[PDB]
Amino acid sequence: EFNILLATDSYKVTHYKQYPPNTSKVYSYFECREKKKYEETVFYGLQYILNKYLKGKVVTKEKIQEAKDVYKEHFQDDVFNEKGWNYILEKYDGHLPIEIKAVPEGFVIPRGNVLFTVENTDPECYWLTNWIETILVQSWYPITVATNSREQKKILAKYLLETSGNLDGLEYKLHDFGYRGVSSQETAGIGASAHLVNFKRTDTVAGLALIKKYYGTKDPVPGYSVPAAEHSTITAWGKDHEKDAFEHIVTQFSSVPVSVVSDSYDIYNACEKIWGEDLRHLIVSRSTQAPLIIRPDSGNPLDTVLKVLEILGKKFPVTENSKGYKLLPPYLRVIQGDGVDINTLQEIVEGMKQKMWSIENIAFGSGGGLLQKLTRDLLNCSFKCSYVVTNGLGINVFKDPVADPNKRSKKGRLSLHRTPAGNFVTLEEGKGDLEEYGQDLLHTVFKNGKVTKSYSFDEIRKNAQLNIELE
Amino acid sequence: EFNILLATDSYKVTHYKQYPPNTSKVYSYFECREKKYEETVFYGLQYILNKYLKGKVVTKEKIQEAKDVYKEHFQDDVFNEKGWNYILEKYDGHLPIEIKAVPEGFVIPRGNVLFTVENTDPECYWLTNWIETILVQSWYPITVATNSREQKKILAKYLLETSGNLDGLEYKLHDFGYRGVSSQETAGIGASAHLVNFKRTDTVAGLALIKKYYGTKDPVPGYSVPAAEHSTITAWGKDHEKDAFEHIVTQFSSVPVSVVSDSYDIYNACEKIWGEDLRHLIVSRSTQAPLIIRPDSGNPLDTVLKVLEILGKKFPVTENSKGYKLLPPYLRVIQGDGVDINTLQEIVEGMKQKMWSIENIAFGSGGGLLQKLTRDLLNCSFKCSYVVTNGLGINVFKDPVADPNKRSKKGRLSLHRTPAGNFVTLEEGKGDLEEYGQDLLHTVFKNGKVTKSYSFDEIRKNAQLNIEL
Ligand SMILES: O=C(/C=C/c1cccnc1)NCCCCC1CCN(C(=O)c2ccccc2)CC1
Numbered sequence: 001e002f003n004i005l006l007a008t009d010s011y012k013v014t015h016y017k018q019y020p021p022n023t024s025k026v027y028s029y030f031e032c033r034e035k036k037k038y039e040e041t042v043f044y045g046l047q048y049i050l051n052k053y054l055k056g057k058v059v060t061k062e063k064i065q066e067a068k069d070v071y072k073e074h075f076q077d078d079v080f081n082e083k084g085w086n087y088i089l090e091k092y093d094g095h096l097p098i099e100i101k102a103v104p105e106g107f108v109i110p111r112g113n114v115l116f117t118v119e120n121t122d123p124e125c126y127w128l129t130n131w132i133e134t135i136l137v138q139s140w141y142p143i144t145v146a147t148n149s150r151e152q153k154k155i156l157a158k159y160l161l162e163t164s165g166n167l168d169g170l171e172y173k174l175h176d177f178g179y180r181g182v183s184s185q186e187t188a189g190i191g192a193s194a195h196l197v198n199f200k201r202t203d204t205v206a207g208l209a210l211i212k213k214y215y216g217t218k219d220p221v222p223g224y225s226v227p228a229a230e231h232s233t234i235t236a237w238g239k240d241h242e243k244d245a246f247e248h249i250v251t252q253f254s255s256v257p258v259s260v261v262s263d264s265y266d267i268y269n270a271c272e273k274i275w276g277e278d279l280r281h282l283i284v285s286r287s288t289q290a291p292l293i294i295r296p297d298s299g300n301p302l303d304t305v306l307k308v309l310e311i312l313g314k315k316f317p318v319t320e321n322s323k324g325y326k327l328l329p330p331y332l333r334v335i336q337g338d339g340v341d342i343n344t345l346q347e348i349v350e351g352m353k354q355k356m357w358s359i360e361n362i363a364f365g366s367g368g369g370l371l372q373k374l375t376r377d378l379l380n381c382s383f384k385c386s387y388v389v390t391n392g393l394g395i396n397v398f399k400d401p402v403a404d405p406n407k408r409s410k411k412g413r414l415s416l417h418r419t420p421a422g423n424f425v426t427l428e429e430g431k432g433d434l435e436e437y438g439q440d441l442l443h444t445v446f447k448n449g450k451v452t453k454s455y456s457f458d459e460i461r462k463n464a465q466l467n468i469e470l471e
Numbered sequence: 472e473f474n475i476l477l478a479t480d481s482y483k484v485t486h487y488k489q490y491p492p493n494t495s496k497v498y499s500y501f502e503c504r505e506k507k508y509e510e511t512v513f514y515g516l517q518y519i520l521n522k523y524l525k526g527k528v529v530t531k532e533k534i535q536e537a538k539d540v541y542k543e544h545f546q547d548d549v550f551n552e553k554g555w556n557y558i559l560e561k562y563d564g565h566l567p568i569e570i571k572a573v574p575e576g577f578v579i580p581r582g583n584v585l586f587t588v589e590n591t592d593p594e595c596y597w598l599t600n601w602i603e604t605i606l607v608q609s610w611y612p613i614t615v616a617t618n619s620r621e622q623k624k625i626l627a628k629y630l631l632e633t634s635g636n637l638d639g640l641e642y643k644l645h646d647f648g649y650r651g652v653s654s655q656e657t658a659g660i661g662a663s664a665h666l667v668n669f670k671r672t673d674t675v676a677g678l679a680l681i682k683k684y685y686g687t688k689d690p691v692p693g694y695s696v697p698a699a700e701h702s703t704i705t706a707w708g709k710d711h712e713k714d715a716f717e718h719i720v721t722q723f724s725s726v727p728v729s730v731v732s733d734s735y736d737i738y739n740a741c742e743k744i745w746g747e748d749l750r751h752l753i754v755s756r757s758t759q760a761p762l763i764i765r766p767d768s769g770n771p772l773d774t775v776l777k778v779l780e781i782l783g784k785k786f787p788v789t790e791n792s793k794g795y796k797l798l799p800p801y802l803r804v805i806q807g808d809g810v811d812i813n814t815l816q817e818i819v820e821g822m823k824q825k826m827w828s829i830e831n832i833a834f835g836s837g838g839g840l841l842q843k844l845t846r847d848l849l850n851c852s853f854k855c856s857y858v859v860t861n862g863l864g865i866n867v868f869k870d871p872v873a874d875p876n877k878r879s880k881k882g883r884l885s886l887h888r889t890p891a892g893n894f895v896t897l898e899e900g901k902g903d904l905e906e907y908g909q910d911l912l913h914t915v916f917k918n919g920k921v922t923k924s925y926s927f928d929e930i931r932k933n934a935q936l937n938i939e940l
């Protein structure tokens with residue numbers, strides 16, 4: 001069973017001996033710190049952490065003793081605030097005397113703004129605010145996946161609008177293939193859920209149960225999949241029987257969309273001769289609601305996409321749409337799901353545009369790039385103390401390292417506001433109290449062991465919409 | 472609760488309908504495919520077998536849940552309810568799978584078979600690749616362990632060169648990665664992988680994983696040290712940094728303590744606060760309880776070098792037997808910002824050029840150690856190599872025309888020692904020719920049971936550096 005006393009950076013066990021004596025309040029905040037582009041971030045995932053790990057009776061006698069026993073050996077020393085944890089157990093029935101205020105989930109906020117704040121609600125528990133830094137900072141991951149996924153949606157929207165005149169099907173154009181490429185089962189659920197903030201297609205099934213339990217949707221499920229082959233279901237037929245494999249698979253899935261990985265031996269042969277000639281009659285007969293989707297999976301991603309489109313365009317009836325771009329027949333599409341990240345996605349769609357191929361023709365799968373190849377420094381997600389009360393006097397505190405101004409933190413009590421022009425601003429030094437800037441956009445989401453304000457996944461999706469979708 | 476029927480890539484739900492009719496066996500293998508990182512540490516499969524694959528993993532309720540979810544997820548009924556029911560009824564929900572693997576902690580060159588998977592009941596031909604997704608997640612502990620060991624090699628080389636020995640090596644790279652990983656579960660897994668090579672970690676989650684799944688003779692596999700963070704310095708107020716420092720070193724007067732010193736001005740902190748105002752509180756400390764000064768910003772090499780130059784003029788420096796400079800034993804440095812395998816190399820080489828012993832310093836690494844890694848780094852990959860259809864075995868493989876690096880191995884595989892004592896993987900069942908001695912893979916899982924396992928102490932032994940041995 002999870003033990004919050006064993007869920008912090010080891011050194012934090014020692015911090016109750018380090019704060020100034022007579023400190024009754026430690027107040028800290030989280031931001032995606034600005035860096036001298038990812039200019040705005042999607043706030044998502046705190047609600048998961050609050051419910052799974054922080055709410056309710058999280059301290060017990062047994063948990064205190066287990067931590068005491070572990071830390072004794074881990075430090076080869078007795079440092080450990082047994083009395084402080086005892087206090088929470090006795091006085092609050094093991095509920096954390098902490099108040100957390102946050103911007104609503106799904107909100108899209110520029111870099112360098114306060115996203116949430118954390119403070120103790122009992123003077124005895126001044127040490128607790130930063131104890132939970134470690135667990136709360138892991139919110140970096142769903143924030144960063146959701147943000148990077150949204151930035152890819154923006155690229156897709158731009159090019160789809162340019163080459164087709166509308167955004168039909170945008171939400172299906174980036175498909176999560178990342179389950180095997182993430183570091184754990186828990187990470188898979190969290191990351192998949194964050195991608196679904198922006199899109200509707202995923203093979204990372206773990207995201208579904210996460211969303212159902214912690215957020216919820218009106219619809220039965222938040223994400224969808226489609227039948228598809230893997231190399232094993234092709235190669236198992238034998239090298240001389242690739243066509244037999246293709247024929248069997250498209251016939252098994254004759255009335256639903258089906259993707260068939262076509263690069264086991266020679267992608268270009270498969271497109272030109274197997275799909276384009278030998279099995280063409282099984283493809284041109286298909287429904288618009290049940291296309292064949294050809295899936296390359298190797299080679300230079302742009303070069304391969306372009307050559308695949310070139311081959312198909314000569315074997316199948318191509319039209320030119322109202323924008324002047326080439327369009328495959330509706331029973332045939334392509335998905336590129338190898339080596340796709342935000343940079344290569346851009347290169348591919350721009351390449352297609354230059355060769356006059358509509359983005360209607362293609363969708364993308366992304367695995368490692370979408371869910372794993374991300375770190376906490378991408379958006380500089382960071383948690384810092386900005387205000388303490390010592391001997392009954394509040395003081396505004398901060399770091400400001402001489403050699404790195406980018407690491408300077410904010411001072412004092414903070415609030416987030418709309419500007420007169422409709423943008424965002426973070427007020428420092430308790431200045432929000434002057435009420436010159438309308439209401440604080442941070443809301444209490446956690447107080448004294450209870451989750452006080454929750455968002456459905458539908459609300460989050462609405463909050464994270466692109467401007468172009470709004471238009 | 473975990474449900475293995477909902478723990479695969481969605482498209483694999485549809486694969487039972489795509490294999491050749493009358494297929495009775497699907498046999499697959501995992502390798503770190505050949506294309507830096509010439510050899511990999513095999514670690515973490517045992518965690519997966521015990522936590523997710525062993526025992527009764529199918530129930531009626533689990534089957535109904537998955538059926539209900541997939542109906543909505545596909546907007547269609549494609550789920551193999553019959554196949555999962557067969558496992559439940561015939562085997563009391565235990566997986567009819569056999570997995571063979573190299574021993575954990577083993578250090579093996581790229582492009583070798585590390586484990587194999589096959590069904591033990593013809594009805595369950597589809598099950599081999601159902602569990603691809605979970606098993607392939609072993610990439611992460613393999614990669615963390617491997618990259619951590621590569622850093623130990625660097626530290627070993629330079630500590631040996633600058634000091635003449637390896638004393639303390641296992642304390643020189645400290646895991647700071649807990650906040651920087653993607654989840655609690657990842658934290659435990661990755662921290663445990665670093666502990667294959669080192670003994671210091673602030674990622675507490677790894678201790679419990681190791682105790683539950685591997686075990687050590689010692690009470691715990693990893694250790695920590697008291698240390699400040701910016702909040703315990705800055706809370707004192709900007710004009711009271713000296714007060715914070717004094718309080719902290721006085722509270723921790725008889726144990727090692729690290730104190731982050733760059734809140735406002737690292738160079739001032741070192742030269743004036745530690746080097747002058749509080750010097751008397753440092754030179755009185757025990758060799759068993761040094762002050763460790765922690766910079767945390769600026770260019771990592773430049774800042775380490777300047778910090779060392781400052782301390783060397785404020786404190787008595789000696790020259791060790793190798794000709795390198797050494798701080799007094801009550802004073803050390805830890806650099807824990809921006810450290811990855813590349814910057815680690817740059818720092819120690821820069822220290823060596825300026826005649827500073829590696830004895831003076833340790834490294835903390837967070838995102839670099841536990842998060843900034845992908846499955847592409849070692850090309851960790853699972854592929855089918857052998858099938859039996861209509862009673863005939865067939866060697867199968869992929870070999871994409873545009874990328875020879877993605878070519879996979881053919882047929883039944885085995886791992887052997889060569890005459891020179893190296894590893895070789897034999898394909899096409901050739902291990903059965905008995906020209907290369909015994910298969911080095913062992914059966915680790917069979918029909919719901921873990922059949923062979925390793926303590927964390929043995930894993931550490933297997934993962935030792937040549938220089939250590
Ligand atoms: O190939 C796999 C999964 C592979 C996988 C999974 C997991 C791990 N590793 C690999 N899944 C098949 C997805 C095919 C979906 C198609 C794409 C083309 N398409 C559009 O572009 C579109 C047309 C009209 C409107 C909107 C979009 C129509 C829908």
Ligand SMILES: O=C(/C=C/c1cccnc1)NCCCCC1CCN(C(=O)c2ccccc2)CC1
Nearest residue numbers: 009639642647673696698729763803805832833
């Ligand atoms: O500063 C932190 C943690 C900060 C943190 C944690 C978590 C997250 N984010 C930040 N931990 C302090 C560790 C200090 C250990 C010292 C290093 C110097 N040293 C040697 O080099 C050595 C000398 C002789 C023999 C062997 C080694 C002696 C041991």
